[PDB]
Design a protein around this ligand. Structure first.
Ligand SMILES: *O[C@H]1[C@@H](O)[C@H](n2cnc3c(=O)[nH]c(N)nc32)O[C@@H]1COP(=O)(O)OP(=O)(O)OP(=O)(O)O
Lengths: 48, 506, 128, 171
């Protein structure tokens, strides 16, 4: 119901990630520390 | 098929066997547009009566098979377990399975156990008596008699008693259903006449034969199809609206803050007042002589207006301002022009009484209150009215009289004093932000969260989880008086309507 | 496991320093006066009110100088804090009663010295 | 016995409640949380005398609130087994005796009350009295009871008094 959809300071909202969010990107043989690095999210249409 | 009722019953009975508290169903504040001080029973009032007596209520058993009455969270937030026990419908009694479920539940949770159905008599009493006979080894006679004496009427369905005695005693010894309150088997078709003053010759009409007749005649005179008060209802004003007020040569009058009352003049001593709550009051010594025959008296006449309190220093004098007339001697004057009806008031009501007021045949110091008419003016002079005491302006179109809501009767009344009804649960913060920081939360109708907050004071803790009249001023809700028998707030829609008025006033 | 008749206290109540009823009354009334000032602070606990009025009813030393004198006269005596406080609070009048209400005083002091101390108590008791 | 001790308690302050004055918020928090409480090991926490030391604020990893270990002088009380204590009588019952020691309810059963002090409901206040009518223990009296022992419980150390030994009863 729309009644319990208010927001006051203190609530958490698990929102879908948008542009500018930080993610960890890695491949499998993490032989060194550059095989697992942080990127910024950009939302592009296709599924890759 | 056939009806139940809710308004006149007691909120609770006496505890049974020191364990069970029989109750009628609490209602949510979602219904506060339908009920008020006298007939509002609300979960906070229950938990609060218990807190004031330092009593915990353990488990509350709901037998109504519905969730439209109140919010179970209002009970569960106080540490009281809530159980909705579905019972057999179709008017039948709780089955042996229902009784076993009730017994299994209640043998778990000194603290009371609240049991309620829509009314708190038949299902509640049946289950309580079954528990007494099985769990507490009572005799069924003792259980039935004790519930009848604790809950004031008690069980009143004959088949209920017959089944109780069949299960736990001798069915041939089952008592007949008790004679019900003759006075309560009656709301099938306010007690104070004027607030703050005591008025002679005015006594409320509760006599069942004549009450319905007076209400019926008012209905038929107004052409009112629905049930309830048939008088015209002015509405809020706030928009680009004063030009609408000068569209159908509306007349203006100052609005004194008074009590709406239609007056039906049906005969010699038949003078009656009807308020917005359809309550009827008989007035004795008010005389309305026929204009043509000063000896004869008026019949089939309906008026409309307010009862106002005038102050002649040292004492308050009641006054009845007649600001419209609906019917006169069965002539539909209400269908005529508003000026025609104003002249009808002046010439056919005030003047015939005022002739005998100078003859000594009518003594104004004998009559219950002063009867006058409300002056009306054009809007050109309303502007001067903005340049006895008025809390605003009324704005009346010149068309024919219309019952019910009139979108075209505009109320323009200085506000700056807009209270709201508010359930005050004081909560001291403990948890995430554990601070002293104990703030009083105000609640409204059909709205689960608090509607606002109020600053806690020494005085305010007195009425906690109670109902507490709170004016709005200085960007804060300010307590003014406790609504000592209303249970919790006004509906959220009503509260939002009030706030819409305060922020966009007229 | 614990026993106040033989000073059998838990290890937590080893550094426990006792207080007199008049001391508690004075300090809690000072706290109440602090609560009277320094606004935007709510009322204290029900425990606070109950303890304050309870020790106000049973107060025996009406002066803080009396408190200091009793504390100085008893602190120089070879007593435990518990025995000292219990003697200064119950205030017996016969040495037999002193040994009966507190059975841990058996042989700590001579009964004539104990009666002298009890007479000093009755001398320093602020009467009403 | 009324005790003046030092106690250690940890306060959780969230960043919304820092304010310009941070330590006064902690002092109000401590006066709020522990005043009027009761613990099984330290008894009735009557009041906090003087907040002595404020520890270093350890920011919990992942959590937002800071944690303050606080040492404070405090006035407390603890009932003890065998301690003779003055009390106020609140109710005289045919089963026992409801008395009060500060905020503590003390229940003295009649079975541990000597045969001289019989119960009487026929008096306008139901009371404890002898056949000599000399020792009259009724409501709102000043009596003494030797604590048999106390039911140490969650936020409760309600005690059981004794009248069996000598010099016990009305003052
Ligand atoms: O989930 C609710 C609700 O969706 C449904 N319900 C109730 N009234 C209506 C209605 O008028 N129209 C529709 N489409 N659906 C409705 O009933 C569900 C709950 O049933 P209840 O048991 O609460 O019905 P209840 O016992 O309250 O009726 P009553 O005994 O008060 O008369």
């Amino acid at each position: 119901k729309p009644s319990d959809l208010h927001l006051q300071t203190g609530y958490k909202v698990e929102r879908h990630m948008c542009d500018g969010d930080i993610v960890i990107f890695n491949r499998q043989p993490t032989l060194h520390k550059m095989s697992m690095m942080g990127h910024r999210v950009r939302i592009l249409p296709w599924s890759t | 098929k056939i009806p139940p009722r809710w308004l006149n019953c007691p909120r609770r009975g006496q505890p049974v066997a020191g364990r069970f508290l029989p109750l009628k169903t609490m209602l949510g504040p979602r219904y506060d547009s339908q009920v008020a001080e006298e007939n509002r029973f609300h979960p906070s009032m229950l938990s609060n009566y218990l807190k004031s007596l330092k009593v915990k209520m353990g488990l509350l058993v709901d037998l109504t098979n519905t969730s439209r009455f109140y919010d179970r969270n209002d009970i569960e937030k106080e540490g009281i377990k809530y159980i909705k026990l579905q019972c057999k419908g179709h008017g039948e009694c709780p089955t042996t399975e229902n009784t076993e479920t009730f017994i299994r539940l209640c043998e778990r949770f000194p603290e009371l156990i609240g049991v309620h159905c829509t009314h708190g008599f038949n299902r509640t009493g049946f289950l309580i008596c079954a528990f007494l006979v099985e769990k507490m080894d009572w005799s069924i006679e003792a259980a039935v008699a004790t519930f009848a004496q604790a809950r004031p009427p008690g069980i009143y369905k004959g088949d209920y008693l017959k089944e109780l005695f069949r299960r736990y005693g001798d069915i041939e010894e089952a008592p007949p259903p008790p004679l019900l309150p003759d006075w309560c088997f009656e709301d099938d078709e306010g007690a104070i006449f004027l607030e703050g003053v005591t008025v002679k010759g005015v006594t409320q009409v509760t006599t069942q034969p004549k009450l319905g007749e007076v209400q019926q005649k008012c209905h038929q005179f107004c052409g009112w199809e629905g049930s309830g008060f048939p008088g015209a209802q002015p509405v809020s004003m706030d928009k680009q609206n004063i030009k609408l007020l000068d569209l159908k040569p509306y007349k203006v009058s100052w609005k004194a803050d008074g009590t709406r009352y239609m007056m039906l003049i049906d005969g010699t001593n038949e003078v009656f007042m009807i308020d917005r709550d359809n309550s009827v009051f008989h007035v004795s010594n008010l005389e309305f002589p026929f204009r043509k025959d000063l000896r004869m008296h008026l019949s089939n006449t309906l008026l409309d207006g307010e009862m106002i309190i005038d102050r002649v220093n040292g004492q308050a004098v009641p006054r009845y301002l007649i600001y419209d007339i609906i019917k006169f001697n069965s002539q539909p004057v209400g269908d005529c022009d508003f000026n025609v009806r104003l002249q009808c008031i002046e010439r056919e009501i005030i003047s015939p009484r005022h002739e005998k007021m100078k003859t000594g045949l009518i003594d104004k110091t004998q009559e219950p209150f002063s009867v006058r008419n409300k002056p009306f003016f054009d809007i050109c002079t309303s502007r001067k009215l903005l340049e006895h005491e008025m809390d605003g302006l009324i704005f009346q179109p010149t068309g024919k009289y219309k019952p019910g809501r009139c979108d075209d009767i505009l109320k323009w009344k200085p506000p700056s004093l807009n209270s709201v009804d508010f359930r005050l649960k004081i909560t001291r913060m403990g948890g995430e932000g554990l601070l002293p920081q104990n703030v009083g939360l105000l609640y409204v109708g059909g709205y689960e969260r608090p509607f606002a907050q109020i600053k806690v004071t020494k005085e305010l803790k007195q009425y906690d989880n109670k109902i507490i009249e709170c004016k709005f001023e200085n960007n804060s809700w300010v307590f003014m008086r406790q609504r000592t028998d209303k249970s919790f707030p006004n509906a959220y829609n009503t509260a939002m309507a009030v706030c819409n008025s305060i922020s966009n006033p007229v | 496991e614990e026993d106040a008749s033989q000073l059998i206290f838990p290890k937590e109540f080893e550094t426990a320093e006792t207080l007199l009823n008049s001391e508690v009354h004075m300090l809690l009334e000072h706290r109440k006066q602090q609560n009277e000032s320094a606004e935007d602070e709510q009322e204290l606990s029900e425990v606070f009110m109950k303890t304050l009025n309870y020790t106000a009813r049973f107060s025996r030393f009406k002066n803080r100088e009396t408190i200091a004198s009793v504390r100085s006269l008893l602190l120089q005596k070879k007593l435990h804090k518990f025995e000292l406080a219990c003697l200064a609070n119950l205030c017996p009048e016969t040495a037999e009663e002193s040994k009966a209400l507190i059975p841990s005083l058996e042989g700590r002091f001579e009964d004539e010295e104990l009666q002298q101390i009890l007479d000093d108590i009755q001398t320093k008791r602020s009467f009403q | 016995m009324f005790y003046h001790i030092s106690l250690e308690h940890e306060i959780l302050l969230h960043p919304r409640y820092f304010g310009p004055n941070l330590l006064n918020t902690v002092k109000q928090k401590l006066f709020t949380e522990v005043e009027g409480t009761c613990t099984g090991k330290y008894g009735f926490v009557i009041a906090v005398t003087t907040i002595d030391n404020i520890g270093a604020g350890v920011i919990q990893p992942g959590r937002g609130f800071v944690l303050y270990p606080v040492k404070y002088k405090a006035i407390v009380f603890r009932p003890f087994k065998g301690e003779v204590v003055d009390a106020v009588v609140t109710q005289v019952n045919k089963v026992g005796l409801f008395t009060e020691i500060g905020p503590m309810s003390c229940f003295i059963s009649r079975h541990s009350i000597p045969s001289e002090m019989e119960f009487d409901p026929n008096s306008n206040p139901p009371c404890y009295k002898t056949m000599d009518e000399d020792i009259v223990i009724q409501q709102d009296d000043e009596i003494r009871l030797k604590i048999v022992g106390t039911r140490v419980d969650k936020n409760d150390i309600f005690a059981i008094g004794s009248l069996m030994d000598d010099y016990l009863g009305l003052v």
